[PDB]
Structure formats: structure tokens, C-alpha cells
Subunit: 117 residues, 3 copies
């Protein structure tokens, strides 16, 4: 069955574990709501952070989510772009879905709304 | 139908938006030419850049490909390997395909030709 | 069948090519053993390293695995997290498998055993 990436992006106001995890959870919850995603259908997830965030792996937020303890995830550094959005967390959630590419609901929150296409 | 990763790598001579966008675009076009890839069959793409490149996200080049506006992409920092190739942009394009693993056509351009297996 | 990610993590004591390749090869072989993985069923692999490792791309270890020469791989920098595990190498190996999400065998070796959930 076909697989598709779902993108998310958000921002935090400060580099703290509380804020990174809160904003990451809110971003995940929104992706799950808009795409009706069940954890068993998630192939894997990639989270990234800009290099001004160091307090915690955003992946930690994934176990705040009931039923998502078996979803494999790893956390990379976003490319450091001159004048790029600061304090930014992104998600690439790869899922089994029949929803067409045009209809996948990518999610941009907080100051990352500027990254919308 | 199976999913397969297609790898690309290229280089720029300088850290400028024009160079990054043109060279990323050309790399994507070459991958698309050699593998006959249609955007609807692309699960997601991951782009990376060595930590000497900062001018622009290479993903911006993807929006210059007509029809590819719904392909999800994210960027990341490539690891900094001592003696590794400088000013390097890489692609992992994940596609649905029946082409056997050994027949997938991975693409190496510019100074990256030295990375070719 | 479905597509699923398999996670691995390990550590090295020194930033040298010999140790990075040896510990990476050992981690890959353990993942392969526990999951019965054949190279042709691997969609692609992502390797990451913390920013304190520079001697070699861990991907080089994949090429000393007989039969794995056509598996696409790329490397990236792990997010730098304060107090995180140092000298850490992770893999995300995407495979076609019938194994349920909760029965995939993720692998944690050396000092990364602490990451085991």
C-alpha cells in the first residue's frame, strides 16, 4: 500500500524542555487530527530542530501520546540557513495512506505559518 | 508496490542562492530523467547540505519543478567529515516503483562524481 | 506487507575511522540478525552521528556488508542536545516487512543501551 510523507513545522519562544515538548506535542496532535493518523500506520518519523534549540529531543513528546510508543523516530539538525526562521521544529511523518498527495494535510503552526506554500 | 530510495549528490562552487538553486534543480531533473519519476509517486524527499552552505534551503528548488508542489521535502545538515567533499548537496528521493534495487539510477553530478559507487 | 522503520543506536569511544566503522557494522549486523532483513527489502537507510564524530561517514560500513551494495544510504547530523549521549551513531533502516509495529526489533548497543525505552 502507498506511503506518503506528512510535514509539520512549529516554533518555540524559548529553548526549554517544557516549551519544546509542549509545542511538539501540539504540532503532532494537529497532524494526527487533520490526517486521521493511527500510530500503527506510521512507517517512521523524522524530527528536526534549528541549531538554536538544545534542551531536549523533540521526539520525547511522542511518548506523551497514548499508543505511539512503538513509532520509530529520530532527531536531526535542520540546515542552518542565513536569515532562516529561528527556534523551529519540523516533522516528517511517513504514513501508510491512500489519501492523494494533493489532499495530505501538512501543518504549520506558531511562527512557522510563514513556511506554508 | 515496493518503495525505493533514489540517491543524488552534487556540489556548488560557492554558497549563493543562485548556485544552490540551479545545482539542486539540475540534480533533481537528472534523477527524474533517468528514473522516469512522476511527482505523484514520490513519498517524500530529504535534502542535505554540508555545514559550509547557508545561503538558501535547497528545497526551494523543488518548487521550480512544475507539478512537484505537493511533494513533501525537508532539509538537514550533512555530517562534517574530515576530508569529506565540500559544498555538497545530497538528495534521498523515496519513490514507489517496481524497478529492482540494482537497477535504480542514482545520480552524481559536478564534484560529487567522486562519490559514485 | 507494509513498510516500517527499524531503529538502532550505538556509541564509539574515539573519533576514528576504525572504531566508527567497526561499531556501525556491528550495529547493522545485529539489526539484520534480529529482524531477518534481506538487503533487497530495504527501501533506504538513514545514519546519523552526533557533531563530535568526524573521522568517516558511518555509511561506509554498509558497503562492507556483502549483498548491500545497492542499498541507498545517507548520513546526517544528530540534533545536538545538552546532556545527550556523546559519540553516538544512529540508524533508521526502512524495510518492507509483515512484522507488526510492536514486534519490530530495535537495537541499542554499547553506551546507547540507556536509550532503550
Amino acid at each position: 500500500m502507498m506511503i506518503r510523507g506528512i510535514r509539520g513545522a512549529t516554533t518555540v519562544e524559548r529553548d526549554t524542555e517544557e516549551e519544546i515538548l509542549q509545542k511538539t506535542k501540539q504540532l503532532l496532535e494537529k497532524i494526527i487530527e487533520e490526517n486521521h493518523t493511527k500510530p500503527e500506520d506510521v512507517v517512521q518519523m523524522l524530527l528536526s530542530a534549528t541549531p538554536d534549540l538544545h534542551a531536549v529531543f523533540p521526539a520525547k513528546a511522542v511518548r506523551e501520546l497514548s499508543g505511539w510508543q512503538y513509532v520509530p523516530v529520530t532527531c536531526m539538525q535542520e540546515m542552518d540557513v542565513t536569515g532562516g526562521l529561528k527556534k523551529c521544529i519540523r516533522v516528517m511523518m511517513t504514513v501508510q495512506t491512500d489519501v492523494p498527495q494533493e489532499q495530505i494535510r501538512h501543518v504549520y503552526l506558531e511562527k512557522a505559518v510563514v513556511l506554508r506554500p
